[PDB]
Amino acid sequence: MEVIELNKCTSGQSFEVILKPPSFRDPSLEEIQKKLEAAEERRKYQEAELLKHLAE
Amino acid sequence: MRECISIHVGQAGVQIGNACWELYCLEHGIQPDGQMPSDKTIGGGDDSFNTFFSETGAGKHVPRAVFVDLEPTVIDEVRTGTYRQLFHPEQLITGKEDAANNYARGHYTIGKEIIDLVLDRIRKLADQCTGLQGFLVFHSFGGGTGSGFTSLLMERLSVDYGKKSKLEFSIYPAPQVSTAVVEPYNSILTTHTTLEHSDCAFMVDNEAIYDICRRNLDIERPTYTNLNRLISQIVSSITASLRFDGALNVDLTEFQTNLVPYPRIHFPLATYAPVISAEKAYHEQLSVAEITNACFEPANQMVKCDPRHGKYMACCLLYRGDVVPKDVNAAIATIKTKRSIQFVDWCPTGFKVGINYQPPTVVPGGDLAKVQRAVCMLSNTTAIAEAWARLDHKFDLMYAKRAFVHWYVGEGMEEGEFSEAREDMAALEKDYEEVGV
Amino acid sequence: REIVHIQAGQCGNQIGAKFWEVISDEHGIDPTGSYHGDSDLQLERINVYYNEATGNKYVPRAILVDLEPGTMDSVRSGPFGQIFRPDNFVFGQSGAGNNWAKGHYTEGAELVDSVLDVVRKESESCDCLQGFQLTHSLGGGTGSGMGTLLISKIREEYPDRIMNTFSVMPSPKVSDTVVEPYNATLSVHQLVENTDETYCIDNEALYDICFRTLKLTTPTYGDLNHLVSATMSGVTTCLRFPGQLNADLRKLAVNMVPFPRLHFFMPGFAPLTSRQYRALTVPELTQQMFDSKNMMAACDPRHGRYLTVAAIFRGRMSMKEVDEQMLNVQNKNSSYFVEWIPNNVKTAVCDIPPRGLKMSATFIGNSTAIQELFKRISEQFTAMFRRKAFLHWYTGEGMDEMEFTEAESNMNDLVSEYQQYQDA
Amino acid sequence: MYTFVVRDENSSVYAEVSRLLLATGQWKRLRKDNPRFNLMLGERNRLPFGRLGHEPGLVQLVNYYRGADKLCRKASLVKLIKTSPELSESCTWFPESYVIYPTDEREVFLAAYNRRREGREGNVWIAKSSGILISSEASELLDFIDVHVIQKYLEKPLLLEPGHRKFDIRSWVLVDHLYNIYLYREGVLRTSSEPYGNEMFFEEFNQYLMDALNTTLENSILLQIKHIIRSCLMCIEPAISTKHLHYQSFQLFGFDFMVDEELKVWLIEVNGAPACAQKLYAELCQGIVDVAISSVFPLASIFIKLHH
Ligand SMILES: Nc1nc2c(ncn2[C@@H]2O[C@H](COP(=O)(O)OP(=O)(O)OP(=O)(O)O)[C@@H](O)[C@H]2O)c(=O)[nH]1
Ligand SMILES: Nc1ncnc2c1ncn2[C@@H]1O[C@H](COP(=O)(O)OP(=O)(O)CP(=O)(O)O)[C@@H](O)[C@H]1O
Ligand SMILES: Nc1nc2c(ncn2[C@@H]2O[C@H](COP(=O)(O)OP(=O)(O)O)[C@@H](O)[C@H]2O)c(=O)[nH]1
Ligand SMILES: [Ca+2]
Ligand SMILES: [Ca+2]
Ligand SMILES: [Mg+2]
Ligand SMILES: [Mg+2]
Ligand SMILES: [Mg+2]
């Protein structure tokens, strides 16, 4: 094996033991605010159709 | 010292958060009233524990956390709990009616009403940081808030904190404690929308935690309190490197560097040992080799799966207690010759080890017994994809008949998002496939 | 999370009245509205069904509706009659004559606006209104005709609220008039469109349970309503006490209704032999709970498949044995549960048992065998409508034969829709 | 009342097992896609091991060992023998083999080929994959490939008399959830009637060895067979054992052996889904239920346990 990058301190210590070497954009606020309002529109439309059905 | 802000969403996230901060105070020696006698620098701090706690002129150490829930009942218990004096009112955000286990209701309908408030409250803690590293987001997959509202928050956070890192602690749904039939829907919906916004996510399957409590703790019918106290231990050892002096996983960026070579494959498997029942009259304290060997037993993993039939991309060993590097390498040597541990060709076969001398802390009067040494392994193994296949199969069974889909469309969602999310999970399973074979 | 209760017509009020007598006893509320219990679990979710008035008294959030004063006078003078809010007694004088048209179009129209005013006064006081629950029959005129009218208008004013009903189905065994199939078919169409959750309570099943099981030679409506009280108390346990499974009306609908039109449930109760000294074992509750003999809908569960199931155990018992007994039922008869809805059986446990029992179990089933109930009503309906018999009672109130053809057609669609998922 | 599913309709063996199970009155067969099952007779390819062992209150058992293909695919079997130190180049019961990809040990395969080319020794090889070609010139067999495997061809096989025939031995081995290795007491020899239903069982073959070679099947052959079976299964045990796993596995294997004129046993290949002999279907399929099924799901020897 191989132990490397051994760092010690009062709290403890760390290291890395190697056994074998290797064989060898996020959407904008506008686009988010757009989809959130698109979903609210589809709700309002579905609700309007119900209130239209009840009016009949 | 760079600060870390914790965000707890939904019942699971809030209750798990309450268990973790209780454990943090016990470990750091912070009393329920926010006082910390061992802290000599009053009102100001550049220490490792200050990455999770701020300080007031009066000497209170306030968690850098924000609780959010679309229902007040769960967060009300924190407002009147043992650590009420710990948090200030601005940190606890609650609505009136929850998401009713509906992803669309928590993401679109109700989420849109409170998203700006939460971000503003988060900005309150961000402005009080000198060098914010990022966020730790606790939530469930099945809950309507934990799944729906978390994906919306993860989106906005990437817009307001594009440079910061974001880590997840996600509760994978298990029917033995499940509360809704559509939890597979919510799990896949929230994973699709959050995948590109999470740098490193630690999944915890309630099934695994449930069985661990039954076998190793002798609890006939474990409760959320039993599960969370055990989950907090795993979370504590994972975040211990951020709260104490050390050299491994010193900042959130290091988690992605050590465990996530591929962005999409950012779901490391966590194994913990030993889990000893405090009821046992006497138990023989396990050695370094015994607890290290237990890290390769599936019965101790946070997600039941067989790493033998997969390949590793990175492994980290986190020891808490009486452990010296010499004993670790000796245990690793014997384990290599008696276990199947295959790494990917382009990755070196090795272990990043970290040792903190303070033994693990257990809630007085809890279920876990105090041990002299414990370990938590964080292995990025393709075997964890078994959990994705399970979810995706249940998803396919229900979606083929469109069962329960109307509840989501009625909240503003479109069936197209169902297929998109499923296709994304289908791609995720293939990524594990090729990397794993 | 307040719930607004409405009871309409003779049956709706007699059953609704008994319901408030059962839960008032469980929550430790006397006929005066004064709490006299010994456990905080009785008051933790007391606000779901009771308003806290001045003097620390508890007023049921119930609206008593009827086109005749008769039955409501009995309630006002009954055991718990004093506890009901006087203003909430909205009634007419003419009646409905067991005529769906009179309750839905003519007589009921005059009185409906008066009821909505009381409903509005109750809703405006609610901190977070879950929705409404309606108790009524479908064979009469007021509860069936006017009840469905109220639901349609309640939904118009509260479209984002849950609509829940306990609906008594007519049966020739316990029949008042021959036009009951007409009124039921007309009402079912309304329920299929304007409710989220409907507990199908079949008077035929109630009668058979009283006769065959309870060994009651001459069952009365009082004996039938005893079963309805026990069932109504059970199905609402998860709503009236602390818990996490189906704790409110919406989360219940999300777990129980995979398709919007298929929201008619089969209720079951155990131990059925109620109205006795030896309590049952957890295995016994589970067995009887799923036994068709304890079903209130008069449908053979083995003639269909379970889309979703909601179990509720009450009393101090081994939750472990409950979990393994529920898993035993599913794994022992997995063919009767659709395999395209994984884990469609959810189980809840409540510490407080019902009155007189140390242990009980309530069953709520969304089975495709419920079609047997609708197919039965449809056959009786067509038997008369095919000869236009007794239609004059309805055409005289402005209705046209076309509206009957549509209702008949809508219910046959409901039957065919239930038959679709019983084979998938 | 235990439940089980059938996801491999082409399984002649487990078609009999599922028949005996039902005939016991304590096993109910479910729909092949029903999750609430105790035992799965899984399909032969792409068995969803990842979905097993996640049903509360269900002890789930499957008739396959995940990862056993490493021993049943000829290409991977060679890699297992040449790579695993437990076997390595010390095992003298496996023919010299090489893996060659059709455009890889092609360069090393020719190295030993020239060794026999230089010498006057026999240089006859065989090329097969998971259509065969036996050739003495390495060129004739390589052109045939274009993944296959090329191994030494037993030029001096044991011949049955009279007839001057060639044969091979098939042994059925059962591994239960505890990893007990049970060798079926009955075997079959598949013979070639042409000089170098064609089934010679052990009873007859044993008498021939006594009357012809003055030995017994046990001493001259069966010892080496039990050694090869034990060695192969004990090597991959850490990789496939379901001792502490959320689901249990068992599996019936089919080992094919070759015997040379020196009474030496050679391993040809291992079959993960073998078919039994018509005469032995009943006895063996009953043993599967006794040892592999009823052991985990009790109800209201024909095997030889190989210790380890
Ligand atoms: N480990 C653990 N899991 C929990 C806990 N609370 C809830 N869960 C899991 O979370 C899932 C349900 O999601 P919840 O968090 O309860 O729902 P929510 O986030 O409050 O969102 P809503 O649907 O609006 O109520 C279930 O599968 C539970 O198993 C907890 O305290 N600990
Ligand atoms: N190295 C070798 N030396 C001599 N003969 C060999 C040999 N490899 C194979 N053979 C001959 O080839 C025949 C078929 O070999 P093999 O067992 O690979 O076929 P197979 O896998 O298609 C059928 P099964 O499913 O029963 O294993 C055997 O009967 C054997 O006699
Ligand atoms: N279970 C039960 N059913 C009833 C009761 N009273 C009437 N019914 C049934 O309801 C139908 C009559 O409707 P009813 O409610 O009396 O007429 P309404 O006053 O116009 O609502 C018949 O089919 C009866 O069987 C009762 O007290 N209990
Ligand atoms: Ca300080
Ligand atoms: Ca980012
Ligand atoms: Mg919630
Ligand atoms: Mg009447
Ligand atoms: Mg073969």
Residue numbers in the entry:
A (entry chain E): 6 to 29, 43 to 74
B (entry chain A): 1 to 437
C (entry chain B): 2 to 42, 45 to 278, 282 to 360, 369 to 438
D (entry chain F): 1 to 103, 126 to 152, 159 to 174, 179 to 228, 259 to 362, 373 to 380
Share the article's original sentences.
Additionally, 4 a–c establish a hydrogen bond to the main chain carbonyl group of Gly100 via their C9‐OH group. In Figure 7, we show the binding pose of the best resolved maytansinoid 4 a and compare it to 5 a, as well as the maytansine orientation. Briefly, all compounds form hydrogen‐bonds between the C1‐O and the main chain nitrogen atom of Val181 and between the C24‐O and the side chains of Lys105 and Asn102. In the studied maytansinoids, all the modifications introduced at the C3 position point towards the solvent and do not perturb the close environment of the maytansine site. For the larger C3 substituents, such as the phenyl ring, we observed a slight reorientation of the C3 carbonyl group, which increases the distance to the Asn101 carbonyl group, thereby weakening this interaction. However, our biological assays showed that this minor change in coordination of the ligand does not have an impact on the efficacy and the binding constants. On the other hand, compound 4 a with a phenolic ester at position C3 was a slightly weaker binder (51 nM). The cytotoxicities determined in this study correlated well with the binding affinities: compounds with high affinity 4 a–c behaved nearly as maytansine, showing nano‐ to sub‐nanomolar cytotoxicities, while compounds with sub‐micromolar and micromolar affinities were less cytotoxic. With 4 a 10 nM concentrations in interphasic cells and 5 nM in mitotic cells are enough to observe similar effects to those noticed with Maytansine in interphasic cells.
